Amino acid sequence: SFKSRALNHVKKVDDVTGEKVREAFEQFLEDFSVQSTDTGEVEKVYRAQIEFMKIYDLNTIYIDYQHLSMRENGALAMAISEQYYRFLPFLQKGLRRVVRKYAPELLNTS
Amino acid sequence: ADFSLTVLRARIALLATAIGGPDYTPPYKLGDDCLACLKDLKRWFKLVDDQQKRWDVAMAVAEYRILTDDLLPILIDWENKCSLAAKLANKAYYDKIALNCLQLLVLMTWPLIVTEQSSSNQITLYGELKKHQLVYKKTILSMESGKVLRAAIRLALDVIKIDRLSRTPRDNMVLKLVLNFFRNVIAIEPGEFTINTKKSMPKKGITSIDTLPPNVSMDDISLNTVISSFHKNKVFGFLLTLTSSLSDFINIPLLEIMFYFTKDVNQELLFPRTSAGFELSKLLQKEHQMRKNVIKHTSARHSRFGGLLSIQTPDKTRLTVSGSQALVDEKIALQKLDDSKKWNKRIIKKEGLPNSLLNSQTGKAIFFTESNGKHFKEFINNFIDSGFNILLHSVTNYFTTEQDRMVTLEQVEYLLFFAWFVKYQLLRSKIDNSADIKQVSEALKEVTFILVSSLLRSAYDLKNWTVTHAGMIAFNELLNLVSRTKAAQDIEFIVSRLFSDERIQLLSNLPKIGSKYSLQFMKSCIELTHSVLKVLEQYSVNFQKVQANYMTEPVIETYINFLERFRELEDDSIKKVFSFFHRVFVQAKEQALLFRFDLIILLREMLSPDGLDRMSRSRKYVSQFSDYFLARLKKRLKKSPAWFVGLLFPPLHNSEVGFYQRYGE
Amino acid sequence: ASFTCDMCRAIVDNVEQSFKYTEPTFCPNPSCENRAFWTLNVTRSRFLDWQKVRIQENANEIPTGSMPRTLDVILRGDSVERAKPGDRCKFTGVEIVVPDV
Amino acid sequence: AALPSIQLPVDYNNLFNEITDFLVTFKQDTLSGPKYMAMLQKVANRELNSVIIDLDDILQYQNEKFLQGTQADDLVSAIQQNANHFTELFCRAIDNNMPLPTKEIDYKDDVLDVILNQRRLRNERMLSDRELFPPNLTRRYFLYFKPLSQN
Amino acid sequence: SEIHVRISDFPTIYSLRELRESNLSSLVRVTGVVTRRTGVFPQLKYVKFNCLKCGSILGPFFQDSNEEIRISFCTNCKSKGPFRVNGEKTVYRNYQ
Amino acid sequence: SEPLRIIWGTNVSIQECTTNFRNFLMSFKYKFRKILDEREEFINNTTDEELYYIKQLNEMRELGTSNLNLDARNLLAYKQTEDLYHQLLNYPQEVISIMDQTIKDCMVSLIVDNNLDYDLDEIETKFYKVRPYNVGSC
Amino acid sequence: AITARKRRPQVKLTAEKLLSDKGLPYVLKNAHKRIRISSKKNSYDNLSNIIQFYQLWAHELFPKAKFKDFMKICQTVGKTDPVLREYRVSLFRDEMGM
Ligand SMILES: [Zn+2]
Ligand SMILES: [Zn+2]
């Protein structure tokens, strides 16, 4: 046997602000609801954009900052404005879970 | 030599071509002699990797993707054959390859453990071999929403149909094998980065602990995926009706599955106790408090501005520091002159079980989605409402026997299983009057207390700290339940005589040793101690006789060392520590034992602006404690200038002056 | 990034990258003695499209005809090559420090 | 790394004594305290930051001593030959001989005085069982050799 | 001693503006104007090396178009060391 | 019996420096500056009795802004602060840090002593700077 | 005969040094003079009023270690020296003789 030590990830600290940002953003991404110049049935533009990505096998999502600004008193928008570099991985985590739910075809280059 | 390895890998690759493949006429199609090929691969596992203790086939099979690209297609399409036919009813043959595929899945998903007894090849191959099991877990959960899980329950239903009388030993084995499949699929978890320590560390440590292979993310492995795929394949329904049908050959794996669900999830996460965005705003305000605190610990001008403070001490000598804010605040200057030291005292170090609440970081939550939270909580609710008392009676009626051969893993998983659901039903009942404490009544039947006591006593005597810690946790929830049923009302009186003498002594001696062990060990010791004290007070053989066994300096060292983590502890835990101090110091009046400088420093560090939340209830308790503590210390020093030096040291165990130090006449 | 050790065939993977080309400090194999002797696996590792573009202050926004101030913008992935020389553009993204690597 | 060594026609203990004797003795008497001690008094009062050593004065000092019959080792030739070392020697002679100020200068505002005073207090406590500095730190003046006039 | 298969009529074409990360280590077909041609040089193809410690000769490494051969350690003495191209045998290919 | 916070190399007490600056940053009146400068007969109470730096800090706090301009001759016009001028010239970074901290303390203390309600958290979060100018000959 | 061979000298806190005048006798001389606790001040300030003396004294006695490390060494050496035990009991023996 070789002299060695077990180094363990489960004793990590988690960023509670980042996780809560991910929760808020994930919910916003899947269920932000609006429509205009049409029926009142809401389009859910970012879920529909995920479908467009799934059709044209894209790998980016365009987000209007003002839609975040109106969401949840704009607290999420302020957080992402002030400390974007901290929260971008958490936003990717949330986006990945939403894509799993509504377009799991896209989790690979496919 | 590695020539044998390339020969092996070549054989496994050819076998991978023999299993089957897609047909363009797309559908998966089995190969010719497919049953013989599957049997030969099972043979390879036994013939080489088990009998020679290697895991080389277990590696090669992952290299040639047999599980993901043959066996799951076979099982899913066979499930589709049977499920489509079931609405309409050579299956008698294809059933055999489906069974053998499930056998191979149980083999390839078998929980790997490395010990001193594991071979050199095994401990070498362990780290990378774990990664392929994680790929297997991802693929098993994701593929067609995990329809292979429905294939597995169909293979189980095809013996549950024939009676309790009818099922042969082979049928019993097949059902147990399906439970092992579910257990394994839950149980796979990322491996630990096992560094070699022959050669010293460089000027930078390990770059990252992440062990996941590049096609896996931790969200693929998270409980959300397990709960989602299990709900969408009605695995929860299968397990619930299976435990409803318990009227015992399979009881150990079923227990083990419930352990593997519960082992790392906190009960209060399943209860609430714009809302997510509102709470995000609350979080942002909480860290903004830290911003307005660190700002005062920050220079108002650039770092090179560099005005020099000199601290003249009370004596005719001078120190120097560059802190621009420290010029107007000697508090900052003193603690900076302390932090400036290059010296640190050197500090000391310190497997066949998985990670759990036994060893996680104390705040490590699982982030359920709301639907997965609902599905999981309703499943375990229905389990409590149906399966708890019978399953616990079944396994404890076993485990009273064969305690000598109860392997350590089996012990810890059993104790944790008991504790988790007892705690859960207490919480659900404290929330809902509709939920009944007696729905976990099997916990209180004296056979159970006897067994858990035996496990704790034996593990302590054997110095098995792992099972000791788990039995301590189980005792905490048992006493929690006992106090509740004391209020709900005979068994309380019975156990309140059975935990006399040797059990008092043992429970008193856990927090004497606990200061040497991990934070969770100490936390469980403190939790047990608070539970014990409130139980004994609810009873109140003599109260002073028991509590004197706790009020001694090794216990206080455990309490202080636990409280050193106050920034990372939860507010309720600080409340529990300070309630213990409240009893010991204010009520029991052994106040001399807490006049020691470790506590003095710790009190200042948490009462400092860099410490507790200004509006915290625990901050209120620390402030309330500290005013009285300072008053009593002031009194004792006014009555004893010797205690200015005694504050620095352990109090004197030479009783002839020790009594005078303790009370001062 | 992803690297195979020189003295044993074990592989480190999903290695995050700093501004410098970052290689692993420890071998994952508990048998192995290696530090800092590696081969990058080009096939397993993942790259991204990257493009620096230099922008200058708008001619109609300079206050009194002095020199325009300049900035370096990094484009990545699908966003590369949407700029063009002489084009007037609006970007959004992160203001970052880049060390002298 | 070892070195060989040689004898030379110079002795710096002797020339140090010659320099300090000159410094406390000479004055321009034909023009009717010692010139350099008066100038060092002006340095002590911090009214003057430069000491100008005249080789003419060293010549006249040598001529006076030779008229009195003693040898004088031709310090002018020595300090024309190796002037860099003799700046250090003259500064050591000055740092020994220099008198106290006659005029007060609001001394407490001088940082180097404060810091070395604090050092001295701490060293008194140490020496009570409870050089002081590198000399250049305490040397406020600058020293210069003025050449020989043609005569 | 060797033949090179020169692939032709590869169906899909890119411009130099059009190359991306997804093309890395793929076969590509590209059009352009040869702007600057350097001289014709010999380049090492199969190269043995000498360790100055232990038994010197090391087996033939195949040289590529991008990187020098790195010898992290000598296999014969399993240690670091200085190295030189071997004199007993080496072989060259044209380069430009 | 207690430690002393000293501007290093000077023996100047930082408590003394702080209070010498405070008692000018509040309770200075602009009339004193015309006593120092030429044309002293141009003193006029209805324009010069103003608490000049209270006026500055009030307009500054209504604008929420961090910076105060300070003509250094105004220190020499005021008896408890003429020594602070020499300390400012000779030991500037320490004295300027002290003046900055004193401006922040004046802003904090005003909203609890003059006691109009204000965002104490805003002042707590903000840094404050003095800008001494006209220090001496150019 | 043996021309010199080198070795590394080392120093640490020790009971004799801790029993020198600048050790605990300094505490008995100065602690009651310098610490003062009052109901007129909050708990954090009063705790600091204790801590400032002991930190300065610990540094002046033994400037190598941090204050927390100093406290740990004091506790352990106090646990494990007979001379220090005799001195410590002698303090309370003196108070008993009052
Ligand atoms: Zn290696
Ligand atoms: Zn070699």
PDB file of N, CA and C in Angstrom, chain B residues 367-417:
ATOM      1  N   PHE B 367     -30.608  21.033  -2.652  1.00  0.00           N
ATOM      2  CA  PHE B 367     -31.472  22.060  -3.237  1.00  0.00           C
ATOM      3  C   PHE B 367     -32.502  21.400  -4.150  1.00  0.00           C
ATOM      4  N   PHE B 368     -33.580  20.944  -3.518  1.00  0.00           N
ATOM      5  CA  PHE B 368     -34.718  20.384  -4.232  1.00  0.00           C
ATOM      6  C   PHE B 368     -35.375  21.432  -5.121  1.00  0.00           C
ATOM      7  N   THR B 369     -35.811  21.010  -6.306  1.00  0.00           N
ATOM      8  CA  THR B 369     -36.877  21.740  -6.973  1.00  0.00           C
ATOM      9  C   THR B 369     -38.188  21.430  -6.257  1.00  0.00           C
ATOM     10  N   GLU B 370     -39.161  22.334  -6.405  1.00  0.00           N
ATOM     11  CA  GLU B 370     -40.398  22.221  -5.635  1.00  0.00           C
ATOM     12  C   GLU B 370     -41.153  20.940  -5.969  1.00  0.00           C
ATOM     13  N   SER B 371     -41.193  20.565  -7.249  1.00  0.00           N
ATOM     14  CA  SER B 371     -41.862  19.325  -7.628  1.00  0.00           C
ATOM     15  C   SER B 371     -41.149  18.109  -7.049  1.00  0.00           C
ATOM     16  N   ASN B 372     -39.815  18.084  -7.113  1.00  0.00           N
ATOM     17  CA  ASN B 372     -39.077  16.971  -6.524  1.00  0.00           C
ATOM     18  C   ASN B 372     -39.236  16.945  -5.011  1.00  0.00           C
ATOM     19  N   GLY B 373     -39.269  18.118  -4.375  1.00  0.00           N
ATOM     20  CA  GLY B 373     -39.545  18.165  -2.949  1.00  0.00           C
ATOM     21  C   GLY B 373     -40.904  17.585  -2.605  1.00  0.00           C
ATOM     22  N   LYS B 374     -41.927  17.938  -3.387  1.00  0.00           N
ATOM     23  CA  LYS B 374     -43.265  17.398  -3.166  1.00  0.00           C
ATOM     24  C   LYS B 374     -43.282  15.884  -3.348  1.00  0.00           C
ATOM     25  N   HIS B 375     -42.673  15.400  -4.433  1.00  0.00           N
ATOM     26  CA  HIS B 375     -42.668  13.967  -4.715  1.00  0.00           C
ATOM     27  C   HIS B 375     -41.932  13.197  -3.622  1.00  0.00           C
ATOM     28  N   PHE B 376     -40.782  13.710  -3.185  1.00  0.00           N
ATOM     29  CA  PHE B 376     -40.014  13.032  -2.148  1.00  0.00           C
ATOM     30  C   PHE B 376     -40.748  13.052  -0.815  1.00  0.00           C
ATOM     31  N   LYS B 377     -41.269  14.219  -0.410  1.00  0.00           N
ATOM     32  CA  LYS B 377     -41.914  14.307   0.893  1.00  0.00           C
ATOM     33  C   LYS B 377     -43.182  13.468   0.934  1.00  0.00           C
ATOM     34  N   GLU B 378     -43.977  13.457  -0.143  1.00  0.00           N
ATOM     35  CA  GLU B 378     -45.168  12.612  -0.134  1.00  0.00           C
ATOM     36  C   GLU B 378     -44.790  11.135  -0.133  1.00  0.00           C
ATOM     37  N   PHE B 379     -43.705  10.762  -0.829  1.00  0.00           N
ATOM     38  CA  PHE B 379     -43.271   9.368  -0.797  1.00  0.00           C
ATOM     39  C   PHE B 379     -42.881   8.940   0.612  1.00  0.00           C
ATOM     40  N   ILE B 380     -42.023   9.716   1.282  1.00  0.00           N
ATOM     41  CA  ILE B 380     -41.602   9.295   2.618  1.00  0.00           C
ATOM     42  C   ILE B 380     -42.744   9.448   3.620  1.00  0.00           C
ATOM     43  N   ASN B 381     -43.673  10.381   3.378  1.00  0.00           N
ATOM     44  CA  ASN B 381     -44.879  10.454   4.194  1.00  0.00           C
ATOM     45  C   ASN B 381     -45.651   9.151   4.118  1.00  0.00           C
ATOM     46  N   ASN B 382     -45.948   8.702   2.898  1.00  0.00           N
ATOM     47  CA  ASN B 382     -46.673   7.452   2.720  1.00  0.00           C
ATOM     48  C   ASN B 382     -45.882   6.272   3.271  1.00  0.00           C
ATOM     49  N   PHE B 383     -44.549   6.334   3.209  1.00  0.00           N
ATOM     50  CA  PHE B 383     -43.743   5.278   3.812  1.00  0.00           C
ATOM     51  C   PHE B 383     -43.925   5.238   5.323  1.00  0.00           C
ATOM     52  N   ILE B 384     -43.827   6.398   5.984  1.00  0.00           N
ATOM     53  CA  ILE B 384     -44.055   6.461   7.428  1.00  0.00           C
ATOM     54  C   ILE B 384     -45.445   5.943   7.748  1.00  0.00           C
ATOM     55  N   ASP B 385     -46.428   6.396   6.978  1.00  0.00           N
ATOM     56  CA  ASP B 385     -47.816   6.032   7.185  1.00  0.00           C
ATOM     57  C   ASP B 385     -48.098   4.566   6.876  1.00  0.00           C
ATOM     58  N   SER B 386     -47.186   3.859   6.191  1.00  0.00           N
ATOM     59  CA  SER B 386     -47.366   2.441   5.890  1.00  0.00           C
ATOM     60  C   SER B 386     -46.228   1.535   6.360  1.00  0.00           C
ATOM     61  N   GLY B 387     -44.997   1.850   5.964  1.00  0.00           N
ATOM     62  CA  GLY B 387     -43.912   0.885   6.019  1.00  0.00           C
ATOM     63  C   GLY B 387     -42.973   0.954   7.205  1.00  0.00           C
ATOM     64  N   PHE B 388     -43.017   2.046   7.976  1.00  0.00           N
ATOM     65  CA  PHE B 388     -41.995   2.289   8.992  1.00  0.00           C
ATOM     66  C   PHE B 388     -41.987   1.197  10.054  1.00  0.00           C
ATOM     67  N   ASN B 389     -43.093   1.062  10.794  1.00  0.00           N
ATOM     68  CA  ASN B 389     -43.087   0.222  11.987  1.00  0.00           C
ATOM     69  C   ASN B 389     -42.812  -1.231  11.632  1.00  0.00           C
ATOM     70  N   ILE B 390     -43.398  -1.714  10.536  1.00  0.00           N
ATOM     71  CA  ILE B 390     -43.168  -3.099  10.138  1.00  0.00           C
ATOM     72  C   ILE B 390     -41.727  -3.298   9.674  1.00  0.00           C
ATOM     73  N   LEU B 391     -41.175  -2.367   8.887  1.00  0.00           N
ATOM     74  CA  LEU B 391     -39.806  -2.557   8.409  1.00  0.00           C
ATOM     75  C   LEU B 391     -38.810  -2.485   9.559  1.00  0.00           C
ATOM     76  N   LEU B 392     -38.994  -1.523  10.466  1.00  0.00           N
ATOM     77  CA  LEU B 392     -38.101  -1.420  11.614  1.00  0.00           C
ATOM     78  C   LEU B 392     -38.223  -2.645  12.506  1.00  0.00           C
ATOM     79  N   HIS B 393     -39.449  -3.139  12.726  1.00  0.00           N
ATOM     80  CA  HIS B 393     -39.615  -4.361  13.505  1.00  0.00           C
ATOM     81  C   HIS B 393     -38.937  -5.540  12.825  1.00  0.00           C
ATOM     82  N   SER B 394     -39.074  -5.645  11.502  1.00  0.00           N
ATOM     83  CA  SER B 394     -38.455  -6.734  10.757  1.00  0.00           C
ATOM     84  C   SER B 394     -36.938  -6.721  10.921  1.00  0.00           C
ATOM     85  N   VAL B 395     -36.317  -5.578  10.633  1.00  0.00           N
ATOM     86  CA  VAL B 395     -34.860  -5.544  10.635  1.00  0.00           C
ATOM     87  C   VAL B 395     -34.317  -5.589  12.057  1.00  0.00           C
ATOM     88  N   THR B 396     -34.995  -4.965  13.029  1.00  0.00           N
ATOM     89  CA  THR B 396     -34.503  -5.055  14.403  1.00  0.00           C
ATOM     90  C   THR B 396     -34.703  -6.457  14.972  1.00  0.00           C
ATOM     91  N   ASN B 397     -35.771  -7.153  14.566  1.00  0.00           N
ATOM     92  CA  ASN B 397     -35.950  -8.540  14.969  1.00  0.00           C
ATOM     93  C   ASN B 397     -34.855  -9.420  14.390  1.00  0.00           C
ATOM     94  N   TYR B 398     -34.349  -9.078  13.203  1.00  0.00           N
ATOM     95  CA  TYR B 398     -33.088  -9.677  12.767  1.00  0.00           C
ATOM     96  C   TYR B 398     -31.954  -9.243  13.695  1.00  0.00           C
ATOM     97  N   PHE B 399     -31.715  -7.934  13.776  1.00  0.00           N
ATOM     98  CA  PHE B 399     -30.452  -7.373  14.241  1.00  0.00           C
ATOM     99  C   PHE B 399     -30.220  -7.573  15.730  1.00  0.00           C
ATOM    100  N   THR B 400     -31.245  -7.941  16.504  1.00  0.00           N
ATOM    101  CA  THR B 400     -30.986  -8.408  17.862  1.00  0.00           C
ATOM    102  C   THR B 400     -30.099  -9.643  17.839  1.00  0.00           C
ATOM    103  N   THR B 401     -30.270 -10.490  16.828  1.00  0.00           N
ATOM    104  CA  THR B 401     -29.344 -11.570  16.542  1.00  0.00           C
ATOM    105  C   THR B 401     -28.194 -11.046  15.688  1.00  0.00           C
ATOM    106  N   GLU B 402     -27.107 -11.813  15.661  1.00  0.00           N
ATOM    107  CA  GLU B 402     -26.003 -11.602  14.727  1.00  0.00           C
ATOM    108  C   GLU B 402     -25.317 -10.245  14.908  1.00  0.00           C
ATOM    109  N   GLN B 403     -25.421  -9.643  16.098  1.00  0.00           N
ATOM    110  CA  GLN B 403     -24.738  -8.377  16.356  1.00  0.00           C
ATOM    111  C   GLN B 403     -23.228  -8.516  16.224  1.00  0.00           C
ATOM    112  N   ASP B 404     -22.684  -9.677  16.596  1.00  0.00           N
ATOM    113  CA  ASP B 404     -21.244  -9.898  16.508  1.00  0.00           C
ATOM    114  C   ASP B 404     -20.739  -9.826  15.072  1.00  0.00           C
ATOM    115  N   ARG B 405     -21.556 -10.244  14.104  1.00  0.00           N
ATOM    116  CA  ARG B 405     -21.192 -10.235  12.691  1.00  0.00           C
ATOM    117  C   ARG B 405     -21.778  -9.054  11.927  1.00  0.00           C
ATOM    118  N   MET B 406     -22.480  -8.142  12.601  1.00  0.00           N
ATOM    119  CA  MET B 406     -22.991  -6.936  11.966  1.00  0.00           C
ATOM    120  C   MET B 406     -21.821  -6.068  11.517  1.00  0.00           C
ATOM    121  N   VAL B 407     -21.574  -6.006  10.206  1.00  0.00           N
ATOM    122  CA  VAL B 407     -20.435  -5.250   9.694  1.00  0.00           C
ATOM    123  C   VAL B 407     -20.682  -3.762   9.935  1.00  0.00           C
ATOM    124  N   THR B 408     -19.582  -3.002  10.065  1.00  0.00           N
ATOM    125  CA  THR B 408     -19.633  -1.596  10.482  1.00  0.00           C
ATOM    126  C   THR B 408     -20.572  -0.769   9.614  1.00  0.00           C
ATOM    127  N   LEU B 409     -20.505  -0.969   8.294  1.00  0.00           N
ATOM    128  CA  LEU B 409     -21.413  -0.298   7.369  1.00  0.00           C
ATOM    129  C   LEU B 409     -22.866  -0.575   7.731  1.00  0.00           C
ATOM    130  N   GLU B 410     -23.187  -1.848   7.985  1.00  0.00           N
ATOM    131  CA  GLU B 410     -24.553  -2.244   8.318  1.00  0.00           C
ATOM    132  C   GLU B 410     -25.009  -1.573   9.609  1.00  0.00           C
ATOM    133  N   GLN B 411     -24.106  -1.474  10.583  1.00  0.00           N
ATOM    134  CA  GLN B 411     -24.438  -0.807  11.836  1.00  0.00           C
ATOM    135  C   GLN B 411     -24.768   0.664  11.602  1.00  0.00           C
ATOM    136  N   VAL B 412     -23.870   1.397  10.930  1.00  0.00           N
ATOM    137  CA  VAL B 412     -24.058   2.844  10.810  1.00  0.00           C
ATOM    138  C   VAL B 412     -25.286   3.163   9.963  1.00  0.00           C
ATOM    139  N   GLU B 413     -25.496   2.425   8.865  1.00  0.00           N
ATOM    140  CA  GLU B 413     -26.682   2.676   8.052  1.00  0.00           C
ATOM    141  C   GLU B 413     -27.954   2.385   8.838  1.00  0.00           C
ATOM    142  N   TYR B 414     -27.945   1.352   9.692  1.00  0.00           N
ATOM    143  CA  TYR B 414     -29.139   1.069  10.483  1.00  0.00           C
ATOM    144  C   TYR B 414     -29.438   2.188  11.483  1.00  0.00           C
ATOM    145  N   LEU B 415     -28.420   2.621  12.242  1.00  0.00           N
ATOM    146  CA  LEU B 415     -28.642   3.681  13.230  1.00  0.00           C
ATOM    147  C   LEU B 415     -29.114   4.965  12.557  1.00  0.00           C
ATOM    148  N   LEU B 416     -28.487   5.326  11.435  1.00  0.00           N
ATOM    149  CA  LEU B 416     -28.878   6.544  10.738  1.00  0.00           C
ATOM    150  C   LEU B 416     -30.296   6.439  10.194  1.00  0.00           C
ATOM    151  N   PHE B 417     -30.661   5.272   9.646  1.00  0.00           N
ATOM    152  CA  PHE B 417     -32.018   5.055   9.155  1.00  0.00           C
ATOM    153  C   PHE B 417     -33.039   5.301  10.251  1.00  0.00           C
TER     154      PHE B 417
END
